[PDB]
Every structure is written in structure tokens, then in C-alpha cells.
Amino acid sequence: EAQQNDIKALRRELELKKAKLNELHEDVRRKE
Amino acid sequence: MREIVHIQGGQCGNQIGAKFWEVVSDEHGIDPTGTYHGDSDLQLERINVYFNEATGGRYVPRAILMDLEPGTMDSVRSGPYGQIFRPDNFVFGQTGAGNNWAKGHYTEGAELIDSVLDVVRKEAESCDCLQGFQVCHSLGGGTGSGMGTLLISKIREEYPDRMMLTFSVVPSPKVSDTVVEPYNATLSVHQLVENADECMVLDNEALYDICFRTLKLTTPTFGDLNHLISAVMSGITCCLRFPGQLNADLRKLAVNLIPFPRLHFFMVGFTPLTSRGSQQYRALTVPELTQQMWDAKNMMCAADPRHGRYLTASALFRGRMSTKEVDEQMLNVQNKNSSYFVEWIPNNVKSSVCDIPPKGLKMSATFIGNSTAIQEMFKRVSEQFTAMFRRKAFLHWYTGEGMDEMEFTEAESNMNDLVSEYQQYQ
Amino acid sequence: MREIVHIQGGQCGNQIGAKFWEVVSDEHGIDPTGTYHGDSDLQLERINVYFNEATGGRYVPRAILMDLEPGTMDSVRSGPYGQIFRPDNFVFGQTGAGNNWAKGHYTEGAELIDSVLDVVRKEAESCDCLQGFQVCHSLGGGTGSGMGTLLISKIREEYPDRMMLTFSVVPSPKVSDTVVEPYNATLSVHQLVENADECMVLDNEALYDICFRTLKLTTPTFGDLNHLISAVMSGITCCLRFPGQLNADLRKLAVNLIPFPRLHFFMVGFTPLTSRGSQQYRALTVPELTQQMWDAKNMMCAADPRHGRYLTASALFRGRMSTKEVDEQMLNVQNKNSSYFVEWIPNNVKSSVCDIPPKGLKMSATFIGNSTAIQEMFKRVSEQFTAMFRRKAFLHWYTGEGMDEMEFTEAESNMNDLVSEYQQYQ
Amino acid sequence: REVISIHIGQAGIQVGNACWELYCLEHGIQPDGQMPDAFNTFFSETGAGKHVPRCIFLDLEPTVVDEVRTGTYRQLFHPEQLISGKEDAANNFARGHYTIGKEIVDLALDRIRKLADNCTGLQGFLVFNAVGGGTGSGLGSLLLERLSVDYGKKSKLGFTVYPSPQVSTAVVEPYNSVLSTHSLLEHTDVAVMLDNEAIYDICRRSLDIERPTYTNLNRLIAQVISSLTASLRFDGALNVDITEFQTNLVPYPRIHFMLSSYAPIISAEKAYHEQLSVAEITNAAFEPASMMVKCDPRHGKYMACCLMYRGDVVPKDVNASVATIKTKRTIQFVDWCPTGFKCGINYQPPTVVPGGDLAKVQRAVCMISNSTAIGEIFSRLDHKFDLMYAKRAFVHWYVGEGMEEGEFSEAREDLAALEKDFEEVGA
Amino acid sequence: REVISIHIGQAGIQVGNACWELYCLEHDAFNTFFPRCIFLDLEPTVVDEVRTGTYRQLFHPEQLISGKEDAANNFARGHYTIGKEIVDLALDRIRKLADNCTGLQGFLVFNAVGGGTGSGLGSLLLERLSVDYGKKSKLGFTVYPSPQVSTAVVEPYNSVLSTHSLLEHTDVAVMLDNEAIYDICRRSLDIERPTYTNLNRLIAQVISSLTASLRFDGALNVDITEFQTNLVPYPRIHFMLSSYAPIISAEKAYHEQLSVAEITNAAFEPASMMVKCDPRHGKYMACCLMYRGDVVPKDVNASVATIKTKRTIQFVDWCPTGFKCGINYQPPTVVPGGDLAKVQRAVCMISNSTAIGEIFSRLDHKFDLMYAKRAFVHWYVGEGMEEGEFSEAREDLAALEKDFEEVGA
């Protein structure tokens, strides 16, 4: 059960990081 | 002109097809007795794609029911839109496979597949310019999966140039009805990767989940789930039946969403889907349709697309709408969520607009994303398959029927090399 | 174009917001069904600020209800104008905090606030140009104070460049509904001074005083209190919805009334507010609105400003008025009582006029004064906080949830230096 | 010859609503834009019988612009002219000069270019703004900066509204006035001040209106502009142009601030019982009970004065009347200037608009003078601006927008230097 | 004198459905059009909308050609597999259309290169027309895919493979994007939500303005052979930016004072080009100005002088006389339900420059990225193609880029 919690935490962190990355990419496109 | 022959297999195929012919007959304005009673002119000129004029305005569907148990045939014949089929098209065995893929693929199929092929041939050459065949079946059952799969292989041997659609449901461990689901689904996919043209993957978890969350139904019987699947199938072949500002046939969608020949497993979604209590609290605009389309909690598969990347995507729109709004919305979702899309492919979204909405609605949409998140289920299945096959559970029920150990190893091999190629292209 | 998304938290927030949406919808001529039935074209020009057109005259309010117990949600859908809210905007927990700021800010908030954030995001991106957010809540309860304050902090780090109004009633010893009022108020104010752009102090004691003398009501239920608060909220944002000879928007008011980033606690009053027995004997001119505006017994807080000094003040006038009269009245009340005003700022009063009165009156006004006397509440609350915390009363319900002791000491220090810093500029 | 008129801010375009109202009612054009050649200075002709004004309304808040889009004159104004932003500067000079100004002034410029290109003998521009706000102050100064670098030699008549000494509506307006004048100093060629308390007192005493709104204020401002452009629009016995004021009234390239007045502002009843001639209106134009800026020229000394005369006026008595003023000793002129007057007479009387509170007068005088009493107002502004700046009140809003503490001190000493400049020319 | 028009594809015949509506509404002057047309497509859905539409009796039944099944956004399918059975029937009709004619100026073709029918059998029709007639002009007004606005996925493959034949087959090729036209309808026509119908209406305006010289007598007439000389300085550089003025609504038109000087200017700003490219990066090689309606030669003469003396735009060092004017007397007509107001005079400008060299370079990367990983190539190869023609079409556009850079210097 412990490893299951690790899975559902790492994906959520991974998801937040991917969303931040998209924001940065969008800003570069607008600024260029 | 362009022709679609319908083939339904097994209990799942028959009941899904029953609801399908209900909604298509209403769209073309045909009564349960078989005679035209519609109002608009538009509903007459494109009924040959699905019907045949017999005599005295009797339009009979171009369908083939196929199973091994009479309960499904009698339930079909009993209900409304049951007396519109030709009784000769109810090709029907007698013994029954019963969730044994070997029975439906080697023993019992061997005496039925001859009769179905006779009917489908006579029904195929009856029309002039065939567009393709349309099959609805399952991958957990025996007479649906095994016989339907064998029928797919024989058909692709005879007609190798014609198109082929397969609406197939796959089993998931959260909704697991039979015990031998992995043994069936793994072998069934082995044949689907080499025989079908494209497969629109379905599942019951997402369907039950959709009716809970978005539709907020209380008792979602199979009728409502089959109603949703039918609405998807009507949306995918609305371009042939009605004029639009931009048309996209079956072949047109296939070439724009399949970048490599073995990468033909899709996810499907339908919009708009709203609760009955909130149907009047909403607008009907293209941006609203797009927000509900690209929601990951709206696919009709239990595979979250945000767990991977989209290779391509498709949006078939129906209704009087401005094409500019269509392209701007597709471009907007292509720029803001840049990481979820593949990089060495710009323009991962093909779009199309038809001018006739489904009956009762103003504007609808159908989404077909070819993502690389679909590989989780194949891994989600293969881990179960190995769990049984490491220790030969239930294996003798198939071995004493003809399958040898090399067949299961081959099915694992094809499953494993497939999940690696999805992982490669992500 | 300029847009306000509305957020109601807790039981206090839900009744205040309920009577608020009735008052605005009645101003814009929208019936309980939610369809337009007004006459003037002017009422349609500025409905984008608070509503969205759905279909066929259906206007839905741009509000989000957020609480923890379903009694408030069902009481909202029961009453009139209850059928206008979109049912999806009823984001909602199930367990209940119950007058425990730690339960409202650490345990139940951590799983509800992602949901309320997602609704707010859709409501913010659904519109084009945000003017600000509008949050109504209390400071004594738990599901309003702790959760709402966490929502404020989360939103401010998301959209940092937009305004934000929060209307908060605060506890007082004479109206003491719960026992842990200071432990909730002191921690809530600590977060408000560092997050909110501007706050509008309210209290229930002054509202009861208004209903006794000015309204002369027999049975002042909560409906009338919410009626007064709603009239104030409509009065301040009237400038964005209607044109006038001198328009003053929310940001224009904020920069004109806040001299220093920590001095953003205002006391509010509204005129005319007269009993039905004396409403017949009255006249409607500018001087009679002012000398009822600037009366100390009309403020909606229990902080008498003549026990302090005025930094700045503002009046928002509604109705066809002469701007010369408006300015000379502000000049007269500032020249006579010069001691009550700050000395190193001349012309302490910002004034504006709008040309649309509320229905039922010919001329009205709305006063917003940023005095220094608001520190009476901070000392008045902090001593009760100290009286329990010196002896560790009720502490374990806060401590055993995740909070430690330095949180209370830091909160004490910040509230204490705040009342100290108000006193220095005094 | 043509002159285009630009309006910035809430007060700016409201003033324009009264001006173009007065213009069409003077030249006999209905609000829809068609007649039932002197209109060529302000209206360009489509060639299909439709006349369009040479003006651009622009501001940052869409409220005041869109009642104009739906009033009676929906069809008079070309749509592109009525520029409108999306959100207001909110009484914040920096916000109008750097944050929001930088997006909107470039659209105004590439508009105003084709207004000038349609013109042939462009006499100049004339701008309307109130310095108390953020739009009229911030992007107004920014617009004047870019106008000076574009044209330079063309006149820019600035009819500005300064904040009143005691009657005020905003609280950060001392900051806005000082920073705005810092650039209005070296850009506007001829800048006319129009206070608000002075106009309030005129409507209270002269027009005997005890309850005036902004409508009457804007009405009489349009009357002064009409009296000032009649010399350009129509022929008279002795006319002047807009390039005449550049030379004849400002002795030094930094002293350009004029006190305006107009006579006779008389209600409908006094005119019936009172007499109009040139001598008494020449008198009434000088008394401080009829000035448009709260200052007293009795405390100052005149450099040069200007006198617009409208209606049935012969030139012999304007000379005799100005002679009587010079022989009086209540007002005195600077030692360096022996002659201090610039006179002008035009044939057409001022027309009246229905609904206004101005009577139909046979003759009128519009006086525009330059003095040193204007130095007292600027000093009066410095006391209360410096009053709050030392403690750094309200500075955090402007510096949060992207400014610093440097521009306050450097703008402060520049206008402080101007105080010393005014005192040394008066000696 | 007559000129016949061919329409290919979903985009081609919808453009024609608006173009012919304008021709009938506009009308011995008719002799050049009255129709001398052919619609042809592989999908029968859009052609048979015409067969039952309002213009049932207007078109002779045979004219409306229609295949059996679509090429489905597949250049190879519409050029090798399915084209081979319908193209022969089409051109063996167009021949007898030309035999009906006596003084044929030329043909004009309408196609979009993104699709399979517009691109594939477009080029196939062009190749048999070039070997059959050779000398007669064939004006091709094509629709190239936009850089950022896009509806298909494999359209880079189609656009490159179509261009390789559009070079040496058509005589005068006018680019038209969809984003640029969308921007035009958004900016000038202030239509915030446009559809394909509005685009096709103003495309017809451009076509009508360049054939009105044949139809009606003007002060300075210009034939189709005139564009052949005056705008293409090299046999392989014929790609024209288009523009039109005044594109204006019904209310704004009355308010503004349309004249010759300002519309000659407005037809030169990049805010009014029919192709998404910035000619500020390029240098004008030649310009052509069709004036319709109320035009005296003086103000058009004065207007080209002001353009030459401006420095916001530059010309090549080769042409001091870098213009070709043309004046016709009859004003442009209007369609009920159309959005363009009636104007005394209008200008359709067709130029040639090096800004077009940017669109090909922009196109190259998108095609290059997909081709490197061999995306979608298996569809085209199984249709009948090979890897040879993909790589060789790639190097043809590479040569064209160097060509524009060399001539522009």
C-alpha cells in the first residue's frame, strides 16, 4: 500500500511540473 | 454511393448494434415498420449508405447479426426496431462458446464462419461502391471476440483494399466480469494489430465513470452505455450521410491520424454531455465543446491521455459553425499545452465540419486521439496475463482445444513489442 | 470587459450572497427563471460583469458557493432566485470543520481547496479582462475563516496583479456566538494583512444597532442584515455597470484610499436607510445624504472613528445629481471638523457620482472611510486572545491538528505590531 | 487650412461632446451628418454629402466612450476615431504613462497620422485634458512627447484643466499635476489653464445657476473655443490665426500659461434688461469675477494680452476701449513691454444651441492673457505636494508600477526652478 | 474573346459557387463567360449540392463532373490511383469547350494544394493541358496552407509535392492563405466569426476585377497576356501577392472618403495582403494595379509617384518603372447577402517580390521534420510513390530559395 501512495504522489508532482513547463514555453513563444 | 456494411458479433455486439440501428433509423426518419416517414428532403438521398430499398418503400438495414446463443436473437427480435431486419441475415449457430476464446476461434467458429461469409458476400456485392465494413464486438467474451476476430481476418483476405472499422471494448481489472479476460484480450489484440484498419478502443470503467460524473445518472444500465457508444458511431460516419463545409470520410481520417501502420488504436469521446438538470444552464458554443472534448476525464477508455503524449488528434464537428473558430480553438490547445503533444509533428489536430446536427441537438463533436498513453493498458493487461501463464492457470481449457504454448508466447511477444513502439514514439 | 468573479464561503457567506444575487438580478431586470424581461436597453449593456448568457435569455450568475455542510446548499436552492445558479458551481465538502480554524485551514481545506480552485479557474478564464475577485465570509466561524483565507492566499499567488475585495464580519464580545472567536479572528487577520488588497470590516453588533434605531424594525431576522450588506456591495460596484458624470472603479478607489500597503481595513456605511414611519417626512438632497452618511451611528462597524483620525474617506453617489453640490458638501464636512482628519493630507475625500439609482429610491449614496480608529477592534480582540493563550485554553484542538505554539506567537506579534503601526500614523 | 482636435480622458471627450454639438448647430448640419465651404477647417467631406469631424476621442475606460457611440451623434463620428481601451489608469500618473499608456498611444498615433494626411494646410493640433486624472495626465504627456518628435513646428494648443485649490475630487492629484507639468512644460507650445472652481463661480453668479452639473461647464468651454476659431473659420474686419498666439503672447520659451476669460456670460433675463456694447465687454473681460482660473492678476503683472471680439463690432471702439484700460492703474504691464495687447474682431456672432443656458447675445469678447499671477497657483500646488511627499505617502503605488524615487525629486526641482524663473522675469 | 474556368476539389468548386454567382449577377460583354466552366471532384457530396441547389437549370448537366470516391487528403491517391480514371473524361470535355470557343485567351484553374484532389489531380490536369495547348495561358489561383492556422496534418507533404508541378505548368500563380483572409475579415470587415462562405465571396471580387478589362471598355484595358509580360521577370518566378481595397463594411464605407490616393496606399500595407507574409522583408520586383469604376488617369498617376518616393517599402534596383496600371469604367457589383458595400471605385493589386521566399522557407522545416522520421510516408508509398520523389521535391524547393535570394540581390 505504501508504494501505491508513492505512485500517486510522484505523478501529481510530475503533473504540476509539466504544467509549469508549458507556461514557460508559452511565454517564450509570446516574447519571441 | 459509398457503402457501409454492418456486422455485429456476440451478445455485446448485438445489443450495441440494436441501440445503433434505433438511432440511425430515427435520423433517417424511418419508422419501426420500415417505411419512410421523415420530413426533410436531406434524409432521403443518403440512406443507401445504410439501407436497401426492398419493395413498397421497405428500407431494410444492411446489417448482419452474429452469435452462438439464441437469447440475444430473441431479445433483438422482441423489441422495437427488431422487425426491420431481414430474417435471413440472422446467421446463428446453436451450441455456444461461453467465454472460451478457443471455442469461438477454432471449434465452433469452424461451422458458422461459412454461413456468415455467404451472407456478407451477397450483401456486399448488392451495392456498387463499397466504402467498408463496420464491426462491433468485445475482447473479453468468446463468441464475440474469437468469432468476430476470425471474421475480420477472413474479410481482410478477400477485400484487402476496402476500409474496416472496429468498435471493440477491452476488459479492465476494475470491472472484471470473467476470469479468463487476460487470456482472451491478449490473443484478440494479436489478431487486431495485423487485420483491422483502425480500432476505436472502449471500456466499461470510463463509461460507468462518465455516467456517474458528467451525466450523473442514478442507474446506468447497459441501455445508456450502449446509447453513448452508438452516438460515437453515428458521429464518425456523419460525413458520408450529410453535406458539410469540409468533408472527411473514413479513409481521410485514417491517413491523418495513423503515422505508422501498427499505431491504430484510438481513444474516443463525445460532446456535449450534460446532466438533465443543467442542460439549460449552459451555452452552445465551439469553445464550450472544446473544453469538454480535451478533458482527460472524458475519454471512453480507462487510459488517462495526460499520462503520455498525443501523436495526432481529430475533431468532427456537426452544426452551423464558423470554421475560423474551429481552427483557432485547435491551435490554442496546441500551443498552451505544448508538452503533451509530440514535437516532430506540427499540426497534430485534423478537423472537419458537417452541416447536419444529430436529432435533438444544435452542435456536437467527436474526438479521436491517437495517444501514446494507450500503452498503459497493454502493460496493465500483460502483467495479468503473465501472472496466469507463469503457472498455467486455466490453460488446459484452451490447450485441449488446439492452442499450444507457442501461441501464448507469441501473444506476449506481440503485446511486448507493441508497448515498446508506443514508448519509442513518446 | 471589466469583470468580477464572486466567491461565497461558509454559512455566513451563503446567506449574504443569496440576498445579494436577488438584488443585482432585480436591478438588471432578470426574473427568477433567469430570463431577461426588462425594458431599458441600458440594463443589457453591462451584464458581462456579473453574468453569462446561456441560451434564450438565460443569464447565469458568475458566483461560486463553497461550504462544508449541505444545509446551506439546500437552503440556497430552495429560496427564490435559487434556480439561477449553475449547479456545478456548488463546490462542496461533506465532513464539516465546525468553528475550528485549524480544521478549516489544515485538515479539510487540503482536499476541498483544489476543487474550489479549479472552479475559480474556469470562471476566471471564461471571461476576458478580470477586474478582481469578490469574497464574502466571516471571521468567527471555521469553514469561512480558515478555508476562505486559504483560498485568498492561493488565489493571490496565482493572479497577483488583480484586485480583490473581501467583505468580512468580525466577532465582538457583545455578539459572541462561538467561544473561540479570538483564536479564529487573530489568525485570520494575520493572513488578511499579508494577502488581501483591501478588506471591508463589518460586524453584527452595528447591524443590530442599525436595525433598531434607523430601520426601526420589529423583528430583524438575518434577511434584513443581509439586505443591508447586499445594498453596500451593489453600491460600490455600481460604477462599472452604469455610466455617470464621474466614474470611479475599484482600482481607482483602492489607490485613492490606501496610503500604505498595510493600512487596508475600511469601515462602511450606506444611505439612505430610514424606517417606513419616517421615510414619508424626508427630503432627497445632497446635504441630507451627507449628514446621514458621516453620522457615527450609521457606520457598519463598532469602531467609532472620532476615537481616532481619518486618513482618507470616499463617497459613491448614485442618481441624477449636481457635481458642484457633491464637492461642496465634502468640503464643508472636512473644513468644520478639521481635527477628525489627518493633517498631512489635504482633501481627504474621494468622490464619485453615477447616474442610475437603485430601484425604490430617487437618490442614494455609499460611504467608505479608511480611519485609524479601526485599531479599537484589534486591541479589543487581542486581549481576549491573550486571556486564553496565557493559560493554554482550548489549545489542544488547534495543536493536535498540525499547528504548533510559534504560530500563535507569530500571529500575536503581527496583530500587535499592526495596531502599533496604526497608532504611529495616528 | 485645417486644425484637428484630440480628446484624452473622461473630462476630455466630455468636453468634445459639447464642442461638436456646438459646431454642427452652428454650421447647420444635423447630427446624422448631412446638410439640409467654411466647414472645411473641422469637417472633411465624403463627397456623398456626408460631413465627418476631424477629431479622435481616446481614453482607457470604455464607459464614457460608448454612451457617445449611442447618443444622437452615433452617425456623425467615424467609428475608428472613437478609440477606447479596456481598463483604466485609475488616477495613477505612472500607470497611464508606463504600464497601460505604452499599449494605447501607438494606436492613437497611427490614427492621427492619416487625419493629418487628409489635411493640406494644417495649422496645428489642439488637445483637451484634465491633469487631475491618470489618462489625461499620463498618456497625455506621453502623447505630447511623441507629437513633438513627429511634427515639432506645428502648434499644439493645450486647453488643460488644472485641479482647483480647494475643490477637488481625488486625493493623489497633487502628485499627478506636478509630474505632468514637468513634461507639459517643454512640449506644449501654448497651454491654456481652465480651473474648475472658477467655472463653478461663473455659473453660480453670472448664469445664476445654483445647481450646475458638468454639462454647463463643458458648454461654455466650447463657447470659448468657438470664439477662438471663428477667426479661422470666418472672415472679419481684423483676423488672427493660431500661429499668431505663438509669437504675440509668450515672451520666453518656458513661460506659456494663459488665463482665459469670456464675456458676456449672461442669462436669458439680464440681456433683455441690459445693454451690450464694445466698451463694457472690454471692461468685463478683465475683472477677476469672470476668469477661468482661480488666481488674481491684480497680484501679478501682464506681459501681453489677447482680445477676441465677435459680432457687430467696429474697430474704432476696440482701440478706444483698450486705451481706457491702459490709462487705468488697477492693472499694470511689465516694464520691458510698452505695448501689451493683441486685438481681433470677427463678423460672425456666437450662435446658440437649444437646451443650453447661454442667451443670444449681440456681441461677445474672448480674452486670453498672460501674467505672473499664474506663478502663485504653481507655488500653491508645490506646498501641498511637498507636504505629503516627504513622508512617502502614496508613493508605493507609482514605484510599484515601475518608477523610482528619482523622478519625484528631479521633477520636483524642475518645477521649483520654474518658480524662480517666473519671479525673475517679473522683476 | 472568352476565357473558361476550371474548378477542382472541395475548395475549388465552393470558390466557383461564389464566383459564378457574381458573374450572373454582374451581367455582348457576357460572351466571355456565357457557362464555360467545369466542376470536378472525387467526392460527389459538394458537386451534387450544386445539382439540387438554386442553380439547377443554370449549369448543363454534363458539366458537373463527379467521381465515385474521394482521394482523402492523399496526393498520391489523387494523382496516381484515382485521378487516372477521371482526368481523361474531364480534359476530353474541356477540349470541346475550347472548340466551342474561337478567341480563347486562356484557362483559369481554382484549387487548394492542401488536399488530395485539389493538389494531385490539379497537377495531373495541368500536365495534360500544358502538352495539349502549350501557348494558351492558364492562370492558377491556388490556396496554400497557412503557417499557424491549419486544418489537416499531412498538408506539408501535399504542398511540396504539388508545388513541384505548379512551377513549370501554370503561367501566373496567385497565392492565397486562410489566416491572412481571416485577418482581413477580422480587421477591415470586423467579422469576428467568419466562415468559408465570406472568404469565397471576396476571392471572387479579385477574380472579377482582373477579367473586367476584357468584359467592359475602360480608359486603359489590360488582357491576360499583359500580366504575362509585365509582372514575371524570369520564367520560373511567377508567384504573386494579392491585395484589394477598399475591403470595407456597409456603414464604414459611407463614413469614410474613399479616393484614389489612399486606396493606392491601403493596397500596399501588409495589413491588407491576401497571403500571410511581410513584404517589408522583401523588395518589390513589379506591381500591377487594376482600377475599377470612377478613375481618371491623373490621380492613379499621382499615387504611384508617392509610393515610389516613400521609403517604408523598397523596390529592386532593376526597375525604375516598376508598375503596370490599368483602368476600367464599370464599378464593382454587389451581392445581396454580401458584406462589401457599394463603392464608386476599387483597386486590386497583384505584385511580385521576395517576401514569398519566406513562405517556402517556413514550409521547408515542417515538411523536413516529418519526413526525417518517415511519418505518414507509408500511406503515399503504398499508393504508388517512392522515396525518390519526396527527396527530389525537397531539393526543388531548396533551389527555389537560392533562386529568390540570388535575384533579390
Ligand SMILES: Nc1nc2c(ncn2[C@@H]2O[C@H](COP(=O)(O)OP(=O)(O)OP(=O)(O)O)[C@@H](O)[C@H]2O)c(=O)[nH]1
Ligand atoms: N471642467 C470639467 N472638468 C471635469 C469634467 N469631468 C471631469 N472633470 C475633471 O477631471 C478630473 C479627473 O479626471 P477625469 O477626466 O474625470 O478622469 P481621467 O482624466 O480620464 O483619469 P481616470 O479617472 O484615471 O480615467 C476631475 O478632477 C474633474 O475636475 C467636466 O465635465 N468638466
Ligand SMILES: Nc1nc2c(ncn2[C@@H]2O[C@H](COP(=O)(O)OP(=O)(O)OP(=O)(O)O)[C@@H](O)[C@H]2O)c(=O)[nH]1
Ligand atoms: N478559401 C477556401 N478554402 C477552402 C474551402 N474549403 C476547403 N478549403 C481549403 O481546402 C483545404 C483542403 O482541401 P479541400 O478542398 O477541403 O478537399 P480537397 O482539396 O477536395 O481534397 P479531398 O479532401 O481529398 O477531397 C483546406 O486546407 C482548406 O483551407 C473553402 O470553401 N474556401
Ligand SMILES: Nc1nc2c(ncn2[C@@H]2O[C@H](COP(=O)(O)OP(=O)(O)O)[C@@H](O)[C@H]2O)c(=O)[nH]1
Ligand atoms: N456496453 C456493453 N457491454 C456489454 C454488454 N453485454 C456484455 N458486455 C460486456 O461484454 C463482456 C462479456 O462479453 P460477452 O457478452 O460474454 O461476449 P460474447 O460471449 O462473446 O458474446 C463483459 O465484460 C461486459 O461488460 C452490453 O449490452 N453493453
Ligand SMILES: Nc1nc2c(ncn2[C@@H]2O[C@H](COP(=O)(O)OP(=O)(O)O)[C@@H](O)[C@H]2O)c(=O)[nH]1
Ligand atoms: N449578517 C449575517 N451574519 C450571519 C448570518 N448567519 C450567520 N452569521 C454570522 O456568522 C457568525 C458565525 O459564523 P458561521 O456561520 O458559523 O461561519 P461558518 O461556520 O464558517 O460558515 C455569527 O457571528 C453570525 O453573526 C446571516 O444570515 N447574516
Ligand SMILES: [Mg+2]
Ligand atoms: Mg476534398
